[PDB]
Amino acid sequence: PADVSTFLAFPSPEKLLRLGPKSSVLIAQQTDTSDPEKVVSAFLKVSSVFKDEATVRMAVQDAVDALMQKAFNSSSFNSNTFLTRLLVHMGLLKSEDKVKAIANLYGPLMALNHMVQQDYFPKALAPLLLAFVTKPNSALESCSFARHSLLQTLYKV
């Protein structure tokens, strides 16, 4: 057995699967969705364990969906700040404060690919995401496959 806090502290595919069949609900339940920065953090930690394998892919996608549905459905949640901070943490947009941009964007890009196809996703964010994923950046160039896929998906939004 495992818990959400331990998973978020040191994310790994196995730790996510160890959360159980209700892992998606637990991730969203244990995240303070009233804080955009904490949602960005949870979104990146969960997506960081994405693997193109049946069980893991499903677990990450379901977690992202539960988390983002809870955050976005709050009429008070500022979706624009979420997007801005997401881009900042992904190293695609600069910020006044100092942040540690994650080293691998593969998982985050694949998670986003899934997220943008869901009903809970605010379509108004699509153009902004598209602008920064197409914008030249070394971190994106190293994840060509995930990047092209996300862009192709964004074209259909």
Partner 1 sequence: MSGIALSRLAQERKAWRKDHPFGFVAVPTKNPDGTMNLMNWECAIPGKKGTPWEGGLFKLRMLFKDDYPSSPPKCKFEPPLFHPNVYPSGTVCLSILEEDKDWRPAITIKQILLGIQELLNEPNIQDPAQAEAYTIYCQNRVEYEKRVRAQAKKFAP
Q: What is the per-residue DSSP string for 49-85?
A: T--SSHHHHHHHHHHHHHHHHHHHT-TT--HHHHHHH
Which C-beta is closer to partner 1: that of 28 or that of 92? 92
* C-beta of residue 28 within 8 angstroms of C-beta of residue 67: yes
Distance CA 152, CA 143 (A): 14
84 binds partner 1 (CB under 8 A): yes
Sign of CA dihedral 99, 92, 125, 69: negative
- Shortest separation between residue 131's beta carbon and partner 1, angstroms: 4
Site string for partner 1, 121-150 (x = CB under 8 A): ------xx-xxx------------------
- Shortest separation between residue 134's beta carbon and partner 1, angstroms: 9
Residues 6+ apart with CB under 8 A from 116: 126, 129, 150, 153, 154, 157
154 binds partner 1 (CB under 8 A): no
Q: Which of residues 95-114 bind partner 1 (CB under 8 A)?
A: 96
20 binds partner 1 (CB under 8 A): no
* C-beta of residue 28 within 8 angstroms of C-beta of residue 69: yes
Interface segment toward partner 1; rule CB under 8 A; list 35-43, 49-57, 64-72, 92-100: 92-100
Mutual orientation of helices 54-72 and 106-115 as an angle, nearest 10°?
A: 60
* C-beta of residue 92 within 8 angstroms of C-beta of residue 130: no
Which C-beta is closer to partner 1: that of 4 or that of 39? 39
Question: How many residues sit in the footprint of partner 1 (CB under 8 A)?
Answer: 12
94 binds partner 1 (CB under 8 A): yes
58 binds partner 1 (CB under 8 A): no
Site for partner 1, rule CB under 8 A: 80, 83-84, 87, 93-94, 96, 127-128, 130-132
